[PDB]
Amino acid sequence: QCVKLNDGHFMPVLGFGTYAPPEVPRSKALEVTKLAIEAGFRHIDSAHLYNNEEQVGLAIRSKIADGSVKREDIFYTSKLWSTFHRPELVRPALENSLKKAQLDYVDLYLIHSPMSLKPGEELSPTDENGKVIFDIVDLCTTWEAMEKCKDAGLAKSIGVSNFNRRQLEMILNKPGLKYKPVCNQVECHPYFNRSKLLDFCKSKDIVLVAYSALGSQRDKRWVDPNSPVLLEDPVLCALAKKHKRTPALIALRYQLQRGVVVLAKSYNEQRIRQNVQVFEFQLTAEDMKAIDGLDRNLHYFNSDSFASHPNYPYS
Numbered sequence: 001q002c003v004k005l006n007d008g009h010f011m012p013v014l015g016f017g018t019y020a021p022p023e024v025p026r027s028k029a030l031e032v033t034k035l036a037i038e039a040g041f042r043h044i045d046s047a048h049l050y051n052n053e054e055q056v057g058l059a060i061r062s063k064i065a066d067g068s069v070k071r072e073d074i075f076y077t078s079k080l081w082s083t084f085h086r087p088e089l090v091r092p093a094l095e096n097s098l099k100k101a102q103l104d105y106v107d108l109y110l111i112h113s114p115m116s117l118k119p120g121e122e123l124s125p126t127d128e129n130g131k132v133i134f135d136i137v138d139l140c141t142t143w144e145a146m147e148k149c150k151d152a153g154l155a156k157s158i159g160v161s162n163f164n165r166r167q168l169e170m171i172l173n174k175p176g177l178k179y180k181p182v183c184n185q186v187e188c189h190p191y192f193n194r195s196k197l198l199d200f201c202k203s204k205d206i207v208l209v210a211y212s213a214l215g216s217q218r219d220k221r222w223v224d225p226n227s228p229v230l231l232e233d234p235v236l237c238a239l240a241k242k243h244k245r246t247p248a249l250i251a252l253r254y255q256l257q258r259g260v261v262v263l264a265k266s267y268n269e270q271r272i273r274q275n276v277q278v279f280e281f282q283l284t285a286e287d288m289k290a291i292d293g294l295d296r297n298l299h300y301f302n303s304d305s306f307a308s309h310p311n312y313p314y315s
């Protein structure tokens, strides 16, 4: 149940999303990651921004220890945050992630966002007016530092996240390119199916990875309350009675049947165990056709703050 990445490695088409708001106890990330694995999840998705790589990496040591899994069975992903885009900060940032999670290597290291921010440790640099500070960085140099990380062995694979077609091409069409990005993790759901972006990636043998596939966690910090609730859509709810599953299962299945590796975030035991049931049924071609027409180019992560960035993925 994996896809072959363009570098020879295999990615499990079902990933577990480990992000949770700060007000949530960090101990939960540890617990739920154990649950997730016990449920069947082998693909695990993290980042330095999440502030949970210590607990996630811990939960993996636990499952390898008790004999539930070996390291070669677990697909672990981390992300270089926007404040470490400068070439000299890439590897040290990676090693930092590797340390917290106490791992030798990460199966996948991505560029979290193309929107570079002020170099430093603070993850949200703000001027004296409380405005987020940007930084100008040639993302092609950042990718070079990522390629050195794959050769250095610290990362089995490298890809991008929140990259639009343009920025993506800047990589592919970059001189002396050693490794194409294996994938591009972006927001993707029936209200925002990235039909066109997905098409482009496939021609380049790159894998679109979908986040917010279940409508997002709807944080009050980026998500507008007046936006539609994905898992309450008439078409999805109706198809759910048809196949006698759940709207979340329909959303996830939708992604699988069209060549998209999809992430599912859940800190609830029974909703984690339910999410793996995505492999137990299949929507019809007409169902796929019906869902394909749910797109309203609606991305839940809506910060007009970043819109002012020259690398703002959307335009």
Ligand SMILES: NC(=O)c1ccc[n+]([C@@H]2O[C@H](COP(=O)([O-])OP(=O)(O)OC[C@H]3O[C@@H](n4cnc5c(N)ncnc54)[C@H](OP(=O)(O)O)[C@@H]3O)[C@@H](O)[C@H]2O)c1
Pocket (backbone or CB within 6 Å): 016, 017, 018, 019, 020, 045, 046, 112, 161, 162, 185, 186, 210, 211, 212, 213, 214, 215, 216, 217, 218, 246, 248, 249, 263, 264, 265, 266, 267, 268, 271, 272, 274, 275
């Ligand atoms: N690259 C990026 O910029 C980026 C941005 C956002 C997210 N991501 C990644 O994508 C992962 C998931 O995306 P997401 O953060 O928006 O979470 P999500 O996949 O969109 O799902 C969000 C909500 O869905 C609920 N849910 C999950 N399974 C369900 C089920 N079977 N039935 C009903 N409800 C269910 C969860 O509630 P409960 O938890 O209470 O079950 C969760 O709060 C994240 O963990 C993160 O790793 C990446």
Ligand SMILES: O=C(O)c1cccc(Nc2ccc(C(F)(F)F)cc2)c1
Pocket (backbone or CB within 6 Å): 019, 047, 049, 113, 114, 115, 162, 301, 306, 313
């Ligand atoms: O990964 C998480 O779970 C996560 C959680 C909180 C915030 C972000 N930040 C973010 C930054 C830029 C973009 C984008 F896409 F606009 F560039 C989208 C999200 C990601």
